[PDB]
Amino acid sequence: ATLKTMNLEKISALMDKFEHQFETLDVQTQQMEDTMSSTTTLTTPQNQVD
Amino acid sequence: HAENAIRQKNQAVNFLRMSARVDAVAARVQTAVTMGKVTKSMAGVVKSMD
Amino acid sequence: FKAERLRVNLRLVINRLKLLEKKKTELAQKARKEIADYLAAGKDERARIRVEHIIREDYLVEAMEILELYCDLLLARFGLIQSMKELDSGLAESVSTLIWAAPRLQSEVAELKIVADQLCAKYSKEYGKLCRTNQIGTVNDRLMHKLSVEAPPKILVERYLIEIAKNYNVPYEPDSVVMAE
Amino acid sequence: FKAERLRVNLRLVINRLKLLEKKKTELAQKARKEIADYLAAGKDERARIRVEHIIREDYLVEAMEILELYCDLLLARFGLIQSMKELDSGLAESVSTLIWAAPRLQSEVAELKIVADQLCAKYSKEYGKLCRTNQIGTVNDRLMHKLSVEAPPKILVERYLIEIAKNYNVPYEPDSVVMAE
């Protein structure tokens, strides 16, 4: 029953989708972090941290 | 951790200055409230004495 | 045309320009470090694009400094705005540049568009959106250059890369074709 | 055509290309190890297929580097896009390649198709899907070669196998027929 419902084609497609979705999430995280950092730059000067 | 420390230091200084400003404003407003009560009481006294 | 509206918008523009130039200087430091990292690797033709970004931002910061100067000048001679009906010579440059640069920096500073409005709605001699664009041939040329949307000179980009490399202890071989011509 | 949409999609394409080239370099290391293991055994005609995979992926990574470069170039000269109505020479290559390669890398990078749209919907001189494909004879030839869907040269495959074997301490006897011709 299971391998009929969840076969190799569907599993492979689902996993490609998982990978692509979390890559997109990797991009979203990077951009979101760039912006989060750009928001607060006068409270954390690079010179002071160095 | 250096970024975190510098950020916390700067934001603590900012919060302190901000609290000082709000304290000044609140003291002024409290003075105004007390003086308004006093002025209302003296107006009532003036009316009654008149 | 409202005077106090113009005053308030000028003060707001000044504050906004201060904040923007501060944070842009900081971001410029960080992106210069990024360009140094890029030069550490063999990627060279890409660091030129990054430093184009950087020098564009630096031109922008200088232009914002000039605009803050002009806004403060108008704000110091505001009564001379309210009294007369036609602007004098002392305020020609400020008004002209603040009307010409408003659409340029409209996205960064929003209040600048309101300032441009109050300065276009107050004048009729060669004024009004159409005539305001027609009589814009008296603005500060330097600010026009800072906000000029053009590919910067290649030699200037090479000089920017040379300096960044020399500072960040990274080797870099400038393009002799442009470095010598 | 929307400008800010194009800007955002360009930034997204840049980030996506960075992530993709990183992870593709990593996967290439691992699959090179796999090819070394394959060569350890007597299986040779199969390692050639695996290394074909590898060099295809490497061409792809180089093409993605070039495309990231061009996207950043457009993003650095975005105002020059908004101001003019016809693209200048400095942006001909970027636009041409980003329109030509979009259907090639549409599966890997989705936002690239949106970038191609905004760059085809903004121009009419030899533009539009049909005319956009007709006027695609000015793209970077190198990128065309990197994304060229063709059986790589056999001698190149032999050189790739020789290097991988020499690095992974595995013996390998190249096909003299191709190794010498």
Side-chain angles (χ1 to χ4, degrees), chain A, chain B, chain C residues 1-123 128 137 139-176 180, chain D residues 1-123 128 137 139-176 180:
Chain A
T2 298
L3 295 186
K4 184 74 192 325
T5 303
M6 279 266 181
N7 48 358
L8 296 182
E9 291 266 308
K10 179 181 196 171
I11 284 294
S12 169
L14 192 77
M15 289 309 126
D16 217 318
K17 202 175 180 196
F18 185 93
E19 173 182 350
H20 273 83
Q21 284 181 170
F22 274 80
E23 174 175 345
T24 286
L25 214 67
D26 181 2
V27 180
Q28 151 173 345
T29 295
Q30 166 164 14
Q31 204 166 8
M32 182 83 193
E33 285 310 353
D34 185 303
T35 299
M36 275 179 170
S37 85
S38 161
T39 294
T40 64
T41 70
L42 308 188
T43 63
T44 304
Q46 186 88 320
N47 183 293
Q48 288 200 11
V49 177
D50 290 8
Chain B
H1 284 133
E3 276 156 13
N4 283 15
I6 293 294
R7 178 183 73 70
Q8 294 272 24
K9 181 178 72 68
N10 294 150
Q11 90 177 3
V13 170
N14 287 125
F15 279 173
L16 198 62
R17 185 184 304 112
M18 201 174 283
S19 179
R21 301 281 190 274
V22 180
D23 263 8
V25 173
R28 203 66 182 78
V29 170
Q30 152 69 9
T31 305
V33 165
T34 300
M35 265 289 157
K37 290 179 188 168
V38 166
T39 288
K40 183 212 170 192
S41 278
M42 272 186 66
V45 163
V46 159
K47 266 66 190 204
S48 283
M49 283 306 303
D50 173 278
Chain C
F1 155 80
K2 296 180 178 59
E4 294 295 328
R5 190 159 144 83
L6 171 56
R7 201 168 212 163
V8 167
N9 284 279
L10 277 169
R11 299 197 292 117
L12 292 170
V13 162
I14 278 179
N15 298 1
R16 177 94 60 165
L17 288 182
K18 289 179 183 166
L19 276 295
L20 280 176
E21 65 189 2
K22 277 189 224 152
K23 83 185 304 182
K24 281 193 187 315
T25 300
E26 187 66 12
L27 266 65
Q29 287 179 3
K30 298 176 179 180
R32 264 195 309 257
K33 172 166 202 333
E34 182 203 13
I35 294 177
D37 290 284
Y38 262 85
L39 277 179
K43 299 188 290 295
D44 193 322
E45 190 46 275
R46 180 96 153 84
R48 299 181 197 169
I49 317 306
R50 305 307 307 170
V51 71
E52 278 196 1
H53 267 79
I54 301 302
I55 67 182
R56 173 84 70 208
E57 203 76 354
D58 286 1
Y59 286 164
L60 188 64
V61 169
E62 292 190 354
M64 288 203 305
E65 291 183 357
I66 300 178
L67 281 184
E68 180 193 271
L69 186 148
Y70 285 158
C71 293
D72 181 65
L73 172 55
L74 286 188
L75 205 65
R77 293 171 192 172
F78 202 57
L80 192 55
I81 282 177
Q82 292 183 288
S83 70
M84 300 185 168
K85 281 165 46 52
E86 69 286 6
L87 55 91
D88 58 326
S89 65
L91 307 183
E93 207 187 8
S94 305
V95 170
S96 302
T97 62
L98 277 173
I99 286 168
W100 175 93
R104 311 299 197 284
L105 310 194
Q106 188 217 41
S107 46
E108 297 83 344
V109 189
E111 296 84 2
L112 200 47
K113 175 52 72 186
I114 296 164
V115 183
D117 294 1
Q118 304 307 308
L119 290 182
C120 174
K122 189 187 164 58
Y123 297 94
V139 309
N140 198 9
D141 55 358
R142 191 169 77 263
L143 192 141
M144 269 187 66
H145 168 231
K146 305 282 157 295
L147 292 186
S148 194
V149 60
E150 292 295 346
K154 284 67 60 182
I155 294 169
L156 173 55
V157 174
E158 293 177 350
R159 293 182 183 174
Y160 256 88
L161 281 183
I162 290 161
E163 297 301 338
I164 296 178
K166 187 255 183 191
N167 190 43
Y168 276 100
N169 306 129
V170 169
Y172 167 79
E173 174 43 89
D175 178 58
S176 53
Chain D
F1 155 80
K2 296 180 178 59
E4 294 295 328
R5 190 159 144 83
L6 171 56
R7 201 168 212 163
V8 167
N9 284 279
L10 277 169
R11 299 197 292 117
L12 292 170
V13 162
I14 278 179
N15 298 1
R16 177 94 60 165
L17 288 182
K18 289 179 183 166
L19 276 295
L20 280 176
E21 65 189 3
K22 277 189 224 152
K23 83 185 304 182
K24 281 193 187 315
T25 299
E26 187 65 12
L27 266 65
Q29 287 179 3
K30 298 176 179 180
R32 264 195 309 257
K33 172 166 202 333
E34 182 203 13
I35 294 177
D37 290 284
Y38 262 85
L39 277 179
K43 299 188 290 295
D44 193 322
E45 190 46 275
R46 180 96 153 84
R48 299 181 197 169
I49 317 306
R50 305 307 307 170
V51 72
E52 278 196 1
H53 267 79
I54 301 302
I55 66 182
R56 173 84 70 208
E57 203 76 354
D58 286 1
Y59 286 164
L60 188 64
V61 169
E62 292 190 354
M64 288 203 305
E65 291 183 357
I66 300 178
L67 280 184
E68 179 193 271
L69 186 148
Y70 285 158
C71 293
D72 181 65
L73 172 55
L74 286 188
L75 205 65
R77 293 171 192 172
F78 202 57
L80 192 55
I81 282 177
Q82 292 183 288
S83 70
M84 300 185 168
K85 281 165 46 52
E86 69 286 6
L87 55 91
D88 58 326
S89 65
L91 308 183
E93 207 187 8
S94 305
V95 170
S96 302
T97 62
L98 277 173
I99 286 168
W100 175 93
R104 311 299 197 284
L105 310 194
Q106 188 217 41
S107 46
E108 297 83 344
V109 189
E111 296 84 2
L112 200 47
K113 175 52 72 186
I114 296 164
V115 183
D117 294 1
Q118 304 307 308
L119 290 182
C120 174
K122 189 187 164 58
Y123 297 94
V139 309
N140 198 9
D141 55 358
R142 191 169 77 263
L143 192 141
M144 269 187 66
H145 168 231
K146 305 282 157 294
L147 292 186
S148 194
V149 60
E150 292 295 346
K154 284 67 60 182
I155 294 169
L156 173 55
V157 174
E158 293 177 350
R159 293 182 183 174
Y160 256 88
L161 282 183
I162 290 161
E163 297 301 338
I164 296 178
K166 187 255 183 191
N167 190 43
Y168 276 100
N169 306 129
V170 169
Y172 168 79
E173 175 43 89
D175 178 58
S176 53

